[PDB]
């Protein structure tokens, strides 16, 4: 599978931007463009050898872990650290076959009983996305946390918090230009902060926006979708034009 390497050690705005761009490049190899936005392929007839992308993450402590991303939805499905691989619960039997092709050289394979959706991971982390800080610091710590999970040195809450970090800084940044821009500024000013409600509302709406965009009549939605501005005010979206600057990838609906 395609591998993208990124290190938090000395990360800059440019190196993070190059990283997200390469992830987007690998995710959209099989995408087609609807209303100027690439649509990720759906799983039907998508060859197994093209189902996943690998993201290798290092930090200053010279620890590395490898995430596996699903090209149908950009989401993290599992990861490898050393001789151990951990996968989220697959949502059907076809996906369970799919993940047997990841990390086939590890001696120890484990599938969590739970999925990797935000509501679950926040239950396990003991905190909501609103109170989990993001940035180069949080990501570096998440890498260490993932690395030592096989070792027995990471507790479940810390592990779920690290997943929440990785998914937002990689999967959601790949999906949304706005969220990539937010991570760039954290790096630019060397600061960590939790995402705001507008980021969270946008993450929650990714599937619904994809539906409204792909079912639209040359841009115009059949019905409006409410989004949240960063200042907290809420606004209706009636057309794809407003979303083109914000959203980089869509999930298949057709």
């Amino acid at each position, epitope marked *: 599978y395609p591998i993208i390497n990124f290190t938090t050690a000395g990360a800059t705005v440019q190196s993070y931007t190059n990283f997200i761009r390469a992830v987007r490049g690998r995710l959209t190899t099989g995408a087609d463009v609807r209303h100027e936005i690439p649509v990720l392929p759906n799983r039907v007839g998508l060859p197994i050898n093209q189902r996943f992308i690998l993201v290798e993450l290092s930090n200053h402590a010279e620890l590395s872990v490898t995430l596996a991303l699903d090209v149908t939805n950009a989401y993290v499905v599992g990861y490898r650290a050393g001789n151990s691989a951990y996968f989220f619960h697959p949502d059907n039997q076809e996906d369970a076959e799919a993940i047997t092709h990841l990390f086939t050289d590890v001696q120890n394979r484990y599938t969590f009983a739970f999925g990797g959706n935000y509501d679950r991971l926040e239950q396990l982390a003991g905190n909501l996305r609103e109170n989990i800080e993001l940035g180069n610091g949080p990501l570096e710590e998440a890498i260490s946390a993932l690395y030592y999970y096989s070792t027995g040195g990471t507790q479940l809450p810390t592990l779920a918090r690290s997943f929440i970090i990785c998914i937002q800084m990689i999967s959601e940044a790949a999906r949304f230009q706005y969220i990539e821009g937010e991570m760039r500024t954290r790096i630019r000013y060397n600061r960590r902060s939790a995402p705001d409600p507008s980021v969270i509302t946008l993450e929650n709406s990714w599937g619904r926006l994809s539906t409204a965009i792909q079912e639209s009549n040359q841009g*115009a939605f059949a019905s409006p979708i409410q989004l949240q501005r960063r200042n907290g005010s809420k606004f209706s979206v009636y*057309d794809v*034009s*407003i979303l083109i*600057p*914000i959203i980089a990838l869509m999930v298949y609906r057709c």
Partner: nanobody, 117 residues
């Protein structure tokens, strides 16, 4: 201070420039604000392309462009309508592409009252 009249179907060009900013490496966006309303995104141009973005209601009427010779970004407005009356603002940012979702940008230009009669 807002700078501040056009006939319906008329033209107007606004300028985005600041002495300290190499705009050819910024994302530029334009917004407009009616008296009782919020600031509405109009159009953006990306730094790391020449890629231009428009709200549907100005497509074919407004054109955004960069003049790298004068380090300036322009919004050319044609076929203006009374409904386009508003204070117009440009914004610029090295990291964020201006959009409707946020107003947090490194640079906000002075407003210009545009009044179509």
């Amino acid at each position: 201070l807002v700078e501040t009249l056009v006939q319906p179907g008329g033209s107007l060009r606004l300028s985005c420039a600041a002495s300290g900013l190499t705009l050819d490496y910024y994302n530029i966006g334009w917004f407009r604000q009616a008296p009782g309303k919020e600031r509405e995104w109009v159009s953006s141009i990306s730094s790391s392309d020449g890629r231009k973005y428009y709200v549907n209601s100005v497509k074919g009427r407004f054109t955004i462009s960069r003049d790298n010779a004068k380090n300036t970004v322009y919004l050319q407005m044609n076929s203006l309508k009374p409904e386009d009356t508003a204070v117009y603002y440009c914004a610029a940012d090295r990291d964020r592409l201006p959009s409707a979702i946020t107003y947090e940008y490194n640079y906000w230009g002075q407003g210009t009252q545009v009044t179509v009669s």
